[PDB]
């Protein structure tokens, strides 16, 4: 299950709805493997080329939005640091998209409440203010 999750995630070189939807189902059905999935998405975000890091963030977004706990909690831990580094490594067009994504996280328009609890969102906001 994990190896598949990983290879499908290597093919995420564009904004593929299918792939994202697929990764989201795998995470949803294998809660036992949560963390390995988070591990894998974070690894991808941290290591792939600057211009595809965004799609890995999309996959991260979908899983947290459509599955929720315990992924929201797990992703919370490195959210800010992964977000900051990504922002600093990509072009302005991509930054705009990163920011729109952060806005939905605060006001998921919604069900109405921080998709992420803890300090992650506050830190991102303060970073965006200064940067
Ligand atoms: Ca700013």
From Swiss-Prot:
Residues 1-123 are annotated as: Interaction with RBP1 CTD (CID). This is Protein PCF11. It comes from the Eukaryota. Signal peptide: none annotated. The gene is PCF11. The chain holds residues 8 to 138 of 626 of the full protein. It comes from Saccharomyces cerevisiae (strain ATCC 204508 / S288c). Present with 2800 molecules/cell in log phase SD medium. Component of the cleavage factor IA (CFIA) complex, which is involved in the endonucleolytic cleavage during polyadenylation-dependent pre-mRNA 3'-end formation and cooperates with cleavage factor NAB4/CFIB and the cleavage and polyadenylation factor (CPF) complex. Independently involved in RNA polymerase II transcript termination. Binds RNA. Seems to bridge RNA polymerase II and the native transcript and may be involved in dismantling the RNA polymerase II elongation complex. Component of the CFIA complex, which is composed of RNA14, RNA15, PCF11 and CLP1. Interacts with RNA14, RNA15 and RTT103. Interacts directly with the phosphorylated CTD domain of RPB1/RNA polymerase II. It is found in: Nucleus. Residues 1-131 form the CID domain.
